[PDB]
Amino acid sequence: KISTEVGITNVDLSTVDKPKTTRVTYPAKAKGTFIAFALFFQLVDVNTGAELTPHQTFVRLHNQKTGQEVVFVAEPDNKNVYKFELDTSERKIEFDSASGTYTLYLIIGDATLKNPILWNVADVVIKFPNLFTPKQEIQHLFREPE
Amino acid sequence: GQVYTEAKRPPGFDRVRNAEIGNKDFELDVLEEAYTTEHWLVRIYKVKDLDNRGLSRT
Amino acid sequence: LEARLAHLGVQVKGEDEEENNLEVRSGRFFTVKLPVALDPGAKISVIVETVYTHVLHPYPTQITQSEKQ
Amino acid sequence: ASGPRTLVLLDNLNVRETHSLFFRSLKDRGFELTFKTADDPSLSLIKYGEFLYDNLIIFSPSVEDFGGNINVETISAFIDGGGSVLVAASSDIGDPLRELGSECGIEFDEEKTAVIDHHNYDISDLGQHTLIVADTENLLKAPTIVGKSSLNPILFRGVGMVADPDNPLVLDILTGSSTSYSFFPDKPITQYPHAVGKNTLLIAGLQARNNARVIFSGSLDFFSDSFFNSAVQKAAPGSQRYSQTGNYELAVALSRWVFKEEGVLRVGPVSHHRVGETAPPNAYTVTDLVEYSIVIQQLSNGKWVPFDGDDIQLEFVRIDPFVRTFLKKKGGKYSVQFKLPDVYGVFQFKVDYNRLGYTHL
Ligand SMILES: *[C@@H]1O[C@H](CO)[C@@H](O[C@@H]2O[C@H](CO)[C@@H](O[C@@H]3O[C@H](CO[C@H]4O[C@H](CO[C@H]5O[C@H](CO)[C@@H](O)[C@H](O)[C@@H]5O)[C@@H](O)[C@H](O)[C@@H]4O)[C@@H](O)[C@H](O[C@H]4O[C@H](CO)[C@@H](O)[C@H](O)[C@@H]4O[C@H]4O[C@H](CO)[C@@H](O)[C@H](O)[C@@H]4O[C@H]4O[C@H](CO)[C@@H](O)[C@H](O)[C@@H]4O)[C@@H]3O)[C@H](O)[C@H]2NC(C)=O)[C@H](O)[C@H]1NC(C)=O
């Protein structure tokens, strides 16, 4: 039960080609705009070469205009490198409404680490395609005498 | 599909159409029974109210 | 049970009936005139009979189709 | 309102001592409290078709046999008879509690799953980062359900839940921070977690169609005497350290709301007539001015004072509203005058006042 920094090797943002790639360090809000998209991860402990799977490896998409937030889990690959991919044609239920700009937050939490990161990497562009409040007033339209 | 309408027929027989019933046993989701005359000639049900706890059914 | 009384009739052992006048002197006491006056030390079998109505209430108000009220 | 007599279940009788402050406050309002062991045989909510205890409180996680007459079906009948039920759960939910939650539309998580946070867990957790510090930012933002004062961060140590998107009634009195996922403490995640995002309510509450408030509270630990009197400071470096948790005010407010004390609206006599008359005439003629007046009361500490009633909407409807106007307050009555619509037939005055944190009308 010894806690060490989570660390990051290379946040590689690679736009999907319906394939140019860009790379950014951990404290660097990626410059540019990406329109769809799969990004590359590389988590590694510090003070000792050790990639350590953290209990929480999410990817949050935030819609600033509408306020909706969708969270995507990340799966480790055979190369010990997480990969997040957005089809732009699948997940119609997941993404009902298309928003021009989406915040792409990164969340990495673990029981035995001491550096919970929430820094957003860059912006994403996706182009896949109540009762309690008082209701609007209705006024009858009277007929006209001849 | 339980009443024996005829002397020698399958239980749940229909005299008018001379055929056995298909959906032998089922439970009405919304229509609780209210009255059924002695000869089953006129059946009166009663639409249930909206569910209290707001469940999908009833 | 004063506001629930049905017919209330008095009797005397044997074939006889008595008149019970209704008066107020409070639970609307009934005055009964004995057929024969009785001196001290006498005994008179008065078979008072009354009937109360609407005094039985079902404690389970809403029984299902198959229950005992 | 409802009867003072309340029956409270306990996993062990030693809970009353640990839960002393809240129970005392709950007894300030004249409530009669009867504590029964969760497994007591002589546990009878209903007897001879008449409910004994008007309100029910449950503080017993780790239960699977409620007792003689207490069943999920019986509790459902209770809530259908106007009872108010309060529940709790701390990592030991049990199948009966999950069934009762499912009936009302709240999907309790797995037995061993506790809501977790890494960005916001206070220094007092001493172990897995599960001592969620729910901030006041994310809240219901209502005046009746969560009070009207200002609160400090509320400590929560329990199992999260997720509201069903079919229920319109279910209202989320709280929501977990964007980082709370509510999964197994120590196990890898290979599938989508339960309420991974802002959907982990943790204080979800119901409001039945017949006005039977129910408040499925996330954690029993939330009502603990230690939580009421403890200090809060998020483990994030350099966060503020409030001296008082601010949990007591929220607990008292939710207790008052669930027992028909803080918000209740009763509809008084209604009256409608031609302008210039005194009695409701049969069969109003077409294009005839009509005046409607309805009194409404608010139950402020039992006074039954007149409701403020800013926005109450009258609807003149046949199958769909022909007219929809705003009642005007005048001498305690909500009165409006409007010409009847040209179309003839049967119609319905239908004053409907459904607002968040209030009674239905
Ligand atoms: C025999 O039996 C039959 C069975 O009942 C009877 O048929 C019924 O007749 C009624 C009325 O005649 C019909 O209702 C009307 O439907 C019209 C078309 O349907 C709309 O459907 C969509 C809406 O669907 C739902 O929407 C919400 C969602 O929750 C829901 O609340 C709502 O109830 C509805 O179910 C919509 O998107 C479509 O575009 C269609 O429009 C519809 O236009 C009518 O709406 C009118 O009228 C109602 C009440 O009459 C008002 O509440 C509406 O707001 C709207 O009001 C407008 O007209 C009024 C005069 O009639 C004005 O006073 C209002 O100001 C408003 O006027 C605006 O619009 C005008 C132009 O339209 C402008 O000139 C104005 O300036 C304003 O801008 C109404 O809902 C039933 O649908 C129909 N039944 C069936 C099965 O079809 C039949 O009447 C019987 N026979 C006889 C002789 O009576």
Which residues of chain D are within 8 Å of residue A118 when distances are taken between CB atoms?
119, 179
Who's near D320: CB < 8 A, 6+ residues apart?
none
* Residue D320 beta carbon below 6 angstroms from any ligand 1 atom: yes
CA atoms within 13 A on the CB side of D213: 27
Between CA D97 and CA D88 the distance in angstroms is: 9
For residue D102, which of D73, D61, D82 has the smallest C-alpha distance? D73
| CB contact D143 to B (< 8 Å) | no
For residue D76, which of B28, B49, B54 has the smallest C-alpha distance? B54
Residue A63 has which token pair? 């819609």
For this entry, resolution in Å reads 3.6
Among D316, D320, D348, residue to substitute to test ligand 1 (most atoms within 8 Å of Cβ) = D320
Exposure b/e, D249-264, CB count within 10 A at least 16 = b: bbbbbbbbbbbbbbbb
Distance from residue D326's CA to the centre of ligand 1 (Å): 21
* Residue A136 beta carbon below 6 angstroms from any ligand 1 atom: no
Mind giving me the DSSP string for C1-41?
-GGGB---B-BBSSS-B--EEE------PEEE--SS---TT
Residue D131 has which token pair? 């001592």
Task: Give how far C61 is from chain D: nearest CA, Å.
Answer: 7
- Asked if D58 contacts D88 with a C-beta cutoff of 8 angstroms, the reply is yes
Residue D45 has which token pair? 């909510």
For residue D11, which of D70, D72, D65, D62 has the smallest C-alpha distance? D62
* D220 DSSP assignment: G
**Chains in contact with C via at least 3 Cβ–Cβ pairs below 8 Å:** D
CB atoms D189 and A73 under 8 Å: yes
3-state secondary structure of B54: coil
- Write phi, then psi, for A16 (nearest 5 degrees): -75, 140
Mind giving me the DSSP string for chain A?
---B----S-EEEE------EEEE-TT----SEEE--EEE----BTTTTB----SEE--EEE-TTT--EEE------TTS--EEE--SSS-TTT--S--S-EEEE--EE-TTBS--B--EEEEEE------SSPPPPB---PPPP-
Q: Name the D residues in 145-184 with CB < 8 Å from any A CB.
A: 168, 178-179, 181
Which residues of chain D are within 8 Å of residue C61 when distances are taken between CB atoms?
49
Pairing label, strands D5-10, D32-37 = parallel
- Asked if D156 contacts D121 with a C-beta cutoff of 8 angstroms, the reply is no
3-state secondary structure of D103: helix
D283: left (phi over 0), alpha (psi -120 to 50) or beta: left
Which residues of chain C are within 8 Å of residue D48 when distances are taken between CB atoms?
59-60
Residue D130 has which token pair? 């599960």
3-state secondary structure of D74: helix
* Residue D322 beta carbon below 6 angstroms from any ligand 1 atom: yes
Between CA A33 and CA D186 the distance in angstroms is: 37
- Asked if D147 contacts D255 with a C-beta cutoff of 8 angstroms, the reply is no
Q: Which atom of ligand 1 is nearest to the CA of D321?
A: 52
For atom 14 of ligand 1, which residue has the closest CA?
D320
H helix intervals, D172-319: 225-228, 247-258
3-state secondary structure of D247: helix
Sign of CA pseudo-dihedral B4, B8, B10, B16: negative
The type of residue at A61 is L
| CB contact B57 to D (< 8 Å) | no
Pairing label, strands A11-14, A38-40 = antiparallel
The radius of gyration of chain C from alpha carbons, rounded to an integer in Å, stands at 19
